[PDB]
């Protein structure tokens, strides 16, 4: 085949043909010596025949068949360790993936959006049986000529082995570096959990360097206190294909830094290991007290915003379901099935409302609107996951980069980290700024914090009821904080009046109205309820950024919101007309 | 101006336009701070204006005046800390720079090809007074179209500085990275040799990166027992351009990497001040103890070397200025002013001969053909500075990387370490090996060492007269090294023969030999000179790699090889006709 000239950006492409045999550089941990040392002096045997360990690149069904054959466990014993952060896939037998430059199809990205997006990304094959599918030259690393691909079945790896009756692990590292420590910690509780008999397939794409980073993980964790950490690099080179401790002198620059960044990441697990054979202190814990940490970002709160100062007014982004249509149309920032003239069925009697976090004087500016249009007790829902509340009247928040405060946290965790840092700025003089557009403090001067509520305070102080979810910002709204909203609507009284708020009254806000919207009014289209909520002044849901350039970190998110709401119309299709009563989470794991 | 679609791989471009100005990104330490940090809260001021340093992008030769007019101090004060590895100068005021992709024009290059390539660069520029040179556009950092250029002066950056009366220190930092360890270790040295008074101005090309990171070294040394780390790497911001702790969404893979390394490096770095506030630990070997040492490569030896095999017979490339012209003539291994044919002219005369390492049986074979054409005195000059010796009539050496094992050692040192080495072998089970073309042993098996001798025990037991010089393996001689032999030849009998060898009998004992054909024969060109010694057997001194891989990392020395070779003709020229009473070193240095 030919090599490509202009490949597109990101190329489907064949890793492993379909072929009865054991994969590229196979090897386990028992294999005897191949070549020598620099020194010719081999580095001692001990430990390695009972590793219970084997590697290679990725494999074909047919290949993993050879392996699960040649192996001497049963298949419930064996654990495939896919160390590919790439995008891949089974076609019938023969193996894909989806390659970029330097194969970094999905570069940047975490565990998960890399997940949901290859089971997206093989989802878009089914429905076909026949694919022109690009050829791949593992010497150079490029795309060649295509040829056709016949399948009638589409699976991820996970599938694919686990109808062998093998066992599964991923970890999503990026080829050419490292795992960062966080997945170190994620592959040792892993580890510690496995059974005794558990033998373990490590692969990467080539078996060569993500491979062999673990391979030679995996003998330090067996043998670091009787092995020393240069016998160990030497003989994973002698079994296998690369030797970690080799700086090359055809890598330079960028490549050259990288492989020295992974040899001192073997030479710090080698420590950790040594100096904790219990493995009790997580990597990452130990890593960053000895300041060999691999850098990670902080989304820890630092500064208290002003989300909303104090004004009689009402908040920002306001509306009600009686509301008019919005004059100022974006078509630009629309998206799939947007409608300027939506159908209004069914808004008369939604009874709900949303808008941006309120200030004092917003929520006495909002109450006579609600109560004037309210059927019945009504009911404000707060989507905000990160740490808020009011001092002196203004709407506050503790804001970490990415508006990220409480990531991670489960709803218990957040009120109580709410409640205490509320408490301790009390009769306190901080700063409370304004951010602007690159969210950095505006004029930023200390004022006096004379009085603190939270929102739920000041609320039913008002006469009003509250519910919290803890919705992370930017983000699709996760399964668990949308089946509590299901949980929530399918007890709340009749008539009951919904204002939902967020930060901004956008993102949050308008997928939880629009999630609202279409459960009670399943006959309206997904295109006409994102389009109407729009229309009343939300975002579009389904928005998603045109040609993504490298600063724009949303993009990813943004697509995550447009697959999920329709997918979230899909399951209201199907379940409302018996109240719901199966799960959006049970659904979704179906 | 336009872009240039495919500019050359290395283009000279223009680097800044001679103005009457403070150049780009120009700040004091003492300065105001500009703008806000993400938490609103300003970090201390202390120490900051006692600190008596400056930084910028690099200076036209009229915005360093404006810089020497600024400062309070005088330019015998001024210390300009070029932080720039990337060749570049002056033509008149005008500050010009040879530019690759990402500015890694001298990508990978030590400071000692750095310096003097960056001279020759700028000496090509001597015989013109107008050259057509690319602008440049600072915001994408690519080439541009050229305009004419009118000059009558060329100068390094060094010699524009010193006169203005005014103080020059380099470092060769690659653009986009931390500086290495030993680059800090250099800093340092220098640092501490400041007088009280001195004030440092540090910039790189864009006063960006490299530069930030060095102003934030000054800071931690002047203040790092008073004021956090978090401190000045924000106030350092605040005067200048860049937050080293920002690693921004843009930033990806390699990029990412490199903003991370250098963030941990200010970090160590603070860290060492902290501990040694007297610097009297280096701090290459603090790292070093710490785990956060950057990679250098080991050039120690780590096996003994079977250089040639105790044999009956003329050991390997051995010649003598009676001998035959060879006939496997490769054109493709030849250089500049090779011909076929040259004079024999003086050869008759010219007692020397020259080949590779020799075992007691070549030794022997060798004997009675010198003995035979000799008229005089017969010594052997031994060019080696790697340690070796004489394991059961076998030439054997300590083989490090590069066959560099004794780089950086003075004579004493070599010697002291060879004969410690060689006794400490006696007696031992050890593995002596011929190394392939990789540099890897061939059959490694351990031999019992019955006897051994310095080769000079070996040479004088057989009746010779021996001299060592200790040059590098691949490396054009130094000075040092090059004076040692002019002041051997000038106390040495007239008629006394010199055989040359080293390991191979190729790169250093070729251009010995040449060397002193040269001083022998000055009436004999240069390209006969070379050619003669290349069809004796030797290589071709001028050899240079037409079109060098990545690879290839002998092409920048042969590069320095056929420079110098040229050099120390002209040197010849003009010192011959009184007997080099003004040594290499001496001409070398006016
Ligand atoms: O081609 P051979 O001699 O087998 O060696 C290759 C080339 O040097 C590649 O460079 P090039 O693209 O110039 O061919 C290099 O990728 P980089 O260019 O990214 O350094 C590979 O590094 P790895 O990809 O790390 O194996 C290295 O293994
Ligand atoms: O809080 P909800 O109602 O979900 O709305 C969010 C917040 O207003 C975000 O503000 P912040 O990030 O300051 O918390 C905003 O980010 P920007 O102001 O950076 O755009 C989001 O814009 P998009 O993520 O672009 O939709 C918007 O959708
Ligand atoms: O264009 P602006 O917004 O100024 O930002 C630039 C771009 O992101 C560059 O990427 P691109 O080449 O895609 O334009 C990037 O170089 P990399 O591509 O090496 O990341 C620069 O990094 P620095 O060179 O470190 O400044 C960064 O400052």
């Known amino acids: 085949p030919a090599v490509v000239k202009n490949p597109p950006k990101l190329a489907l492409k064949i890793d492993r043909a379909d072929v009865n045999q054991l994969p590229r550089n196979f090897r386990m941990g028992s294999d005897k010596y191949v070549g020598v040392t620099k020194t010719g002096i081999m580095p001692t045997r001990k430990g390695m025949d009972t590793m219970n360990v084997s590697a290679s690149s990725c494999f074909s069904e047919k290949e993993l068949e050879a392996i699960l054959k040649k192996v001497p466990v049963k298949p419930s014993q064996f654990y495939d360790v896919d160390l590919r952060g790439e995008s891949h896939g089974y076609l019938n037998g023969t193996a894909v993936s989806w390659f970029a430059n330097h194969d970094w199809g999905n570069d940047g990205r975490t565990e998960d959006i890399i997940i949901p997006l290859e ?76 059974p005794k008999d558990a033998w373990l397939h490590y692969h990467s794409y080539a078996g060569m360097g993500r491979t062999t980073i673990f391979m030679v993980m995996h003998d330090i964790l067996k043998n670091a206190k009787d092995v020393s950490f240069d016998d160990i690099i030497q003989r994973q080179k002698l079994i296998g294909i690369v030797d970690l401790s080799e700086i090359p002198d055809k890598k330079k620059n960028y490549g050259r830094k990288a492989y020295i960044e992974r040899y001192q990441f073997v030479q710090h697990f080698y420590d950790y290991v040594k100096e904790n054979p219990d493995l009790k202190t997580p990597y990452s814990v130990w890593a960053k007290k000895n300041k060999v940490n691999s850098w990670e970002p902080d989304y820890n709160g630092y500064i208290w915003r002003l989300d909303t100062k104090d004004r009689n007014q009402l908040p920002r982004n306001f509306r009600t379901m009686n509301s008019a ?128 509520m939270t929102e739920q305070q000041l609320v039913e102080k008002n006469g009003l009821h509250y519910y919290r979810i803890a919705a992370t910002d930017h983000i699709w709204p996760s399964a668990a904080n949308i089946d509590e909203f299901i949980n929530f609507t399918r007890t709340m009284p009749a008539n009951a009046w919904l204002h939902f708020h967020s930060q901004a009254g956008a993102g949050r806000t308008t997928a939880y109205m629009a999630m609202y919207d279409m459960m009670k009014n399943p006959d309206v289209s997904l295109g006409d309820i994102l389009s109407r909520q729009y229309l009343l002044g939300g975002n579009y849901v389904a928005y998603e950024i045109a040609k993504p350039k490298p600063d724009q970190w949303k993009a990813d998110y943004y697509h995550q919101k447009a697959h999920m709401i329709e997918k979230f119309y899909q399951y209201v299709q199907e379940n409302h007309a018996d109240g719901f009563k199966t799960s959006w989470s049970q659904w979704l794991a179906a």
Do not use: C
Not at 164 to 186: C, E, S, W
């Open 119 to 194: 089971k997206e990304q093989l989802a878009s094959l089914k429905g076909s049986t026949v694919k022109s599918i690009y050829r791949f030259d593992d010497k150079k690393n490029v795309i060649l000529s295509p040829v056709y691909v016949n399948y009638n079945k589409v699976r991820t790896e996970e599938e694919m082995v686990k109808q062998h009756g093998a066992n599964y692990f991923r970890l999503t590292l990026q080829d050419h570096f490292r795992p960062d420590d966080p997945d170190v910690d994620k592959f040792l509780e892993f580890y510690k959990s496995l």
């Open 325 to 452: 249509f919005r004059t100022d149309v974006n078509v630009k920032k629309t998206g799939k099935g947007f409608t300027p003239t939506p159908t209004r069925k069914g808004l008369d009697t939604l009874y709900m409302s949303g808008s941006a976090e309120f200030s004092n004087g917003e929520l006495q500016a909002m109450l006579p609107v609600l109560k004037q249009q309210a059927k019945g007790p009504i009911y404000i829902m707060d989507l905000r996951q990160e740490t808020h509340g009011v001092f002196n009247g203004n709407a506050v928040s503790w804001y970490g980069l990415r508006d990220w405060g409480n990531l991670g946290k489960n709803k218990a965790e957040v009120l109580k980290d709410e409640n205490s840092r509320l408490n301790a700025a009390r009769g306190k003089s901080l700063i409370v700024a304004e951010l602007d557009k690159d969210k950095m403090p505006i004029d930023p001067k200390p004022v006096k914090i004379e009085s603190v």
